[PDB]
Amino acid sequence: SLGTSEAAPPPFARVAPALFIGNARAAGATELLVRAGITLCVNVSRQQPGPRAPGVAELRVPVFDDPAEDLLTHLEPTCAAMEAAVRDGGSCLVYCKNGRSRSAAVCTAYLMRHRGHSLDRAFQMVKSARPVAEPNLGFWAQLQKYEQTLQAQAILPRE
Amino acid sequence: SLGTSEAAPPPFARVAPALFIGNARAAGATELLVRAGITLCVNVSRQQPGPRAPGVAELRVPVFDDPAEDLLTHLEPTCAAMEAAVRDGGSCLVYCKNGRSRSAAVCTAYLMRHRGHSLDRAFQMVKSARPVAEPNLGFWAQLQKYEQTLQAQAILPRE
Ligand code: NA
Ligand code: NA
Ligand SMILES: [Zn+2]
Ligand SMILES: [Zn+2]
Ligand SMILES: [Zn+2]
Ligand SMILES: [Zn+2]
Structure with a gap:
């Protein structure tokens, strides 16, 4: 509504071009999604x-x-x-129930995989958009393994 | 089981390299999936x-x-x-409840998108693997629209 602010916050936030992180309350926010x-x-x-x-x-x-x-x-x-949705011109929203562990881990993976960021840089970007973002420590280990695979695959540099 | 045949059929069938179509009974077929x-x-x-x-x-x-x-x-x-799962070396199984309309339409889309087949050729391949494959006519129209988009995008030839 062109007001005047929105009392409740949007159920997502922009992490990077064409990339948003949020929580499951976004599911019903039809107009905000469009x-x-x-x-x-x-x-x-x-x-x-x-x-x-x-x-x-x-x-x-x-x-x-x-x-x-x-x-x-x-x-x-x-x-x-x-990446396919993004390259076709749409924006992607990654959400989980509370917008904390699962969605953060997936957004972080995407930034390493398709935006050229190291794990630390990628997670910092997610955290900046959504401070409560926090992949559980098991997911953090899996992200490190993914990062190493990306390096072996020449998708990420060793630096 | 190295026998001796399997009484019940597998809940999926090979459409093309690294691509299978099936039904939801595949979900529990852990050993066949592996x-x-x-x-x-x-x-x-x-x-x-x-x-x-x-x-x-x-x-x-x-x-x-x-x-x-x-x-x-x-x-x-x-x-x-x-395609990402396939290029990383795995096989993909596409299933729906009964292995008819939805899974057929998705396998057909994949063959056009990533294997260079026209809609007709792609659907013939699915049908050959699984005779009851039959996208509903609404999905068939959507597949035709996708085919035209792929042509405009130079992914498929006009021929
Ligand atoms: Na760790
Ligand atoms: Na049609
Ligand atoms: Zn729950
Ligand atoms: Zn739960
Ligand atoms: Zn049902
Ligand atoms: Zn149903």
Whole structure:
């Protein structure tokens, strides 16, 4: 509403061009999703609702927020879906229930994979957009393994 | 089991290198998934179960099998996730509840997008692997629109 501020904050925030992080309350925020030009919601949860907005695709990454969970195997295909939506001109929103561990880990992976950032730089960007972003320590280890794989693959430099 | 045949058929079939189509009974077929080297299940449903197999990622594409449903917007990011899993060496299984409309449409999209096949050739390949494959007519129209977009993008030839 062209006012006047919005009392409640938006349920997401911009991390980088065409990339947003948020929480599951975004699912129902149809008008905000359309206004931001989001075309893909990456729902990193097993049971959180998805969007029902016109022109907005959902991809669900059904992982528990647990250090023993295998986020790693999901990272490469998830990041590829994200990049394809981005290169086709849409924006991507990555959310989980509370916008903390799972969505942070996925956004961090994407920034390393497709924006050329080291793990530390990528996580700093997520943290700046959303201070409560905090991948669990199991996911942090998996992100380090992904980073090393990216280096071996010449996607990231050793530096 | 090295026998002796398998009484019940496998819940999927090979469409092309690194690409399988099947139904939701595949979700629980842990040993068959591992044996086929499947690393990504694309679950094209809202409520069908996913795999719980080690080293197997799931991506859910939560669309109803209805001609009015917007499969189209999901196609590009879904196919990109599939190609990334494939290029990293895994095989991809695309399933829906009954292995008919939704999974057929997604496999057909992938073959056009990443294997250079026209819509007709791509669908013939799916049909050959799984005769009951049959995208609903709404999805067929969306696939035609995707094909035209791919042509405009120089991904497919006009021929
Ligand atoms: Na660590
Ligand atoms: Na048609
Ligand atoms: Zn829950
Ligand atoms: Zn939970
Ligand atoms: Zn159902
Ligand atoms: Zn249903």
